From Swiss-Prot:
Residues 3-85 form the PDZ domain. The modification Phosphoserine is found at residue 63. It is found in: Cytoplasm. The gene is Lnx1. E3 ubiquitin-protein ligase that mediates ubiquitination and subsequent proteasomal degradation of NUMB. E3 ubiquitin ligases accept ubiquitin from an E2 ubiquitin-conjugating enzyme in the form of a thioester and then directly transfers the ubiquitin to targeted substrates. Mediates ubiquitination of isoform p66 and isoform p72 of NUMB, but not that of isoform p71 or isoform p65. Isoform 2 provides an endocytic scaffold for IGSF5/JAM4. Disulfide bonds: none annotated. Interacts with CXADR. Interacts with MAGEB18 and MAGEF1. Interacts with the phosphotyrosine interaction domain of all isoforms of NUMB. IGSF5/JAM4 interacts with isoform 2 through the second PDZ domain, other isoforms may also interact with IGSF5/JAM4. Isoform 1 and isoform 2 are expressed in the heart. Isoform 1 is also expressed in kidney, lung and skeletal muscle while isoform 2 is also expressed in brain. This is E3 ubiquitin-protein ligase LNX.
Length: 85
């Protein structure tokens, strides 16, 4: 796994990542990265990356709903632990 730090300019700003579940395996995955958004401009995240944790909260067997809630909860800093096949 590897670390990605994204910073929100405002607490309500979205990261520009659509997170999804999969029918046949556990995990929270990136479906797409929105052009010009925070994640896109940072440049590291790719489609199909798995989000393993956000700000120290484990998402290995978590949901995109929990991920969204955690992203929103942070005032600015979003520390993602990510894996890529």
């Amino acid at each position: 796994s590897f670390h990605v730090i994204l910073n929100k300019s405002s607490p309500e700003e979205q990261l520009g990542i659509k997170l999804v579940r999969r029918v046949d395996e556990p995990g929270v995955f990136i479906f797409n990265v929105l052009n010009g958004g925070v994640a896109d401009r940072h440049g590291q995240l790719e489609e199909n990356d798995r989000v393993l944790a956000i700000n120290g909260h484990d998402l290995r067997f978590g949901s995109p709903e929990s991920a969204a809630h955690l992203i929103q909860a942070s005032e600015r800093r979003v520390h993602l632990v990510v894996s890529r096949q």
